[PDB]
Structure formats: structure tokens, C-alpha cells
């Protein structure tokens, strides 16, 4: 069974051992705030090794995927992917809103009992909405690789902007799409660029395999460190009802709705397909970064489910930044919970508008240093409540952030399969013309 299955067995063993190690250390030992940071050094090294692959992999994969297809074919695949993402995001938002209202988590609990912590960021609705369009078209290609644009209101008020560290993935993806479309129609005059980017994509994909050898140790030291820096278990019991709603919504959306759509569109068993990405699911659960888990998703989808490369290379990078299913559901549930906690009554129109604004703001903060805080604040401002009540959820915002990634990755795989099957005619016809 070994060699055939070594990476998955090592990852499972490391995940099992890390929880035990972390529980034992915290229980029977006392560590200072400085000593708790040196215990997670291998995890940080793994995190900053995985962050180094995102730029070349994304750029080369997007260019290669776009340039391979014809101009007429690419638009149809993009339209299908966009429609599927939008529809399932709407479905997830609806499911989350109804689920939190039905159970009624914050009817009994009062705001006074619950403590709060964290720093609420400064947020402007229209400014944040326009910052997305600004970041879609960066002023500099080199600066876009490690900086982002932000604007703030100051002084009867003026608008001033500045650049801050953080990879701009939206602008890079848009430019890669445009460049691939341009060089795909040049014919012979762009073949050198096509070959260069194909070789770069292959070389980048071969480097992740080296990191996969060190991955189990970093995973073991990464999950143990999360169970040593936990503040206390009092807040977990004080917020147990809140976590139940989000977890139930995520589980329902992952188990019922997505396989239902997959079985309706394509006539295949949807559970073996999900099993084929188990390593990707564990990677998403631990690292909890949809962008950093991209190479593992590529390897799992292409090698284990026989999905066409020309479909993954175009769909998966796009889905790495645009899919908002987990984010939108969590934000909607948390906003309704905060509204229930305070003296606010939710009507039908209020529910509809809060769902609409949650759906819009989930994708509005597509790329932000702390996007979960921006989206919640916008929804709370829309409903009336201030941004100072977001600090209640921050105490458990490190546990529910990990669960969303696996759902997003699994849904991206399902959408890749659905889009590949939905355009089978042009995939079997472009091979000869």
C-alpha cells in the first residue's frame, strides 16, 4: 500500500499526532507568549514556503490555459463558470440565512454576558466597493506583484490613497487573462511565448512536489500551535450555539446541495469525485488559504479524476479568488446572530436586503488583508448596527475560517467537472481544427 499511498498516510498521521502533542503540552506545561511563538517555527516556515509559489504558478497557469483554447471557446467556458459560481453563491446565502433564523441562536443569550476582543477596522462602503475596481486595473505591473491599493476619507471630505504590502491577485489574474487571449490569436508570432509559459508552468508544478516532502512536519507543528494559543474554553461554551449554526450550514451545503447539482448536470457518483481530493481537503483544512492550496488542488483534480487540463488551468485559478460560498454563508449567519443578540426585529424585507448586501459584500472584499472584518462591517452598517459589535465573533474567527476553505476547494473541483462536461462538444472538436 506504500508508495501507492505515502503522502496521504503521512498527512493523516501528522494531523492525528499534532492534536495529541498540542493537547498534552498546553495541559501539562506552561509556556510564555514568547515561547509559544518559537514552538510554531516549522509551521511558519512551511507557510512562507507555500506563499512563494502563488505568483508564478497563477500567472503561468492562467496564460497557458487561456492561450490553449480558441477565442470563441474561451468566452463560453468563462460564462458557464461565472453563472455557476453566481448561482451556487446565491443558493448558499439563502441556505445560511434560513438556517440561522430557524434555530434562533441569540434569543436567550444577552450581549452583556458575552465578552469581546479584537480591533475593528475602518471601513467605508462605497470606497471599499470602488477599491475592487481600482485593484482590477493596477497602475504598475511589477508593483502589483506585492502591493495593493487602499483609499481613505480624510480632511468637506477628500479621498487619499496609498499602497500597502499584499499580493494583488485580482489584477494579476485579469492581466494574465487578457495577455493569454492576445497571444493566443497571434498564431506563429506568439508560439515562443506560449512555449516559455508552458515550460514555466511545468517547472513551477515540479517544485511543489519537493515541498510536499517537508509538508507533514510543518502540518504537525502547525496544528499543534493552534491548540496552545487558544485563549480559554469559557468563550467556546459561551459561543457554542453560534459555531453550531455555521458548521451545520457548511456541512449541509457540502454534503447535499453541491452533490445534488453535480448529479443533476453529470450522471456520475459524486462521492468518489470528492474522495479523490481528500489530500486537497486536508490541505485546505490545515493551511486554510484557498490561494496557497492551489497546486495541491491541481494535482488532485488532474491526476485522480482524469479531468481535462485545459479546463482546470482555466477554471481553478479563477475560482481561487472569486468563489465566496463559505465566506458569504458565515457572514450572513453572523450578521443575523448579531442582529438577534441586540434589540432588533428582522422583517421579510429586512431579511431580503440583508441577504442581498451580504451576497454583494462577500465578493466585494475579494482580496483584503482581513476580508472577514470588512464584509461583516458592511452588512451591519446596512442593517443599522455599528461596527463595534463585530468583536464578539473575533474570539472564534480562527476556527471557522479553516472550515470554509475545504468547502471552497471541493466546490471548485465540482464546478471544474461540471464545466468540463457541459462543453464536451467543443473539447472534442477543437482537436482537429
Residue numbers in the entry: 14 to 168, 199 to 476
What did the published study say regarding this structure?
Human excitatory amino acid transporters (EAATs) concentrate the neurotransmitter glutamate and aspartate in cells. By coupling the uptake of one substrate molecule to movements of five ions—symport of three sodium (Na+) ions and a proton and countertransport of one potassium (K+) ion—EAATs ensure that the cytoplasmic glutamate concentration is ~10 mM, which is required for neuronal functions, while the extracellular concentrations are as low as a few nM permitting rounds of synaptic signaling. EAATs are homotrimers composed of promoters that work independently.
EAAT3-X was predominantly found in OFS in NaCl buffer and iOFS in NMDG, NaCl/glutamate, and KCl buffers. Notably, we observed no K+ ions bound in OFS determined in KCl buffer and assigned the state as apo (described in detail below). We observed no density in the K+-binding site, suggesting that potassium did not bind to OFS even though it was present at 300 mM. We term these nearly identical structures (RMSD 0.57 Å) OFS-ApoNMDG and OFS-ApoK and refer to them collectively as OFS-Apo for short. Strikingly, the YE/DDR motifs of OFS-Apo are in the bound configuration, while their NMD motifs are in a configuration intermediate between apo and bound conformations. Inspection of the Na3 sites in OFS-ApoNMDG and OFS-ApoK revealed distorted geometries of the ion-coordinating residues, including shifted N366 sidechains. We found excess nonprotein densities at the sites, likely due to water molecules. In contrast, in OFS-Apo and OFS-Na+, E374 is buried and proximal to G415. It is likely protonated with pKa-s of 9.2, 10.0, and 7.6 for OFS-ApoK, OFS-ApoNMDG, and OFS-Na+, respectively. OFS-Apo features an open HP2, protonated E374, and bound-like NMD and YE/DDR motifs.
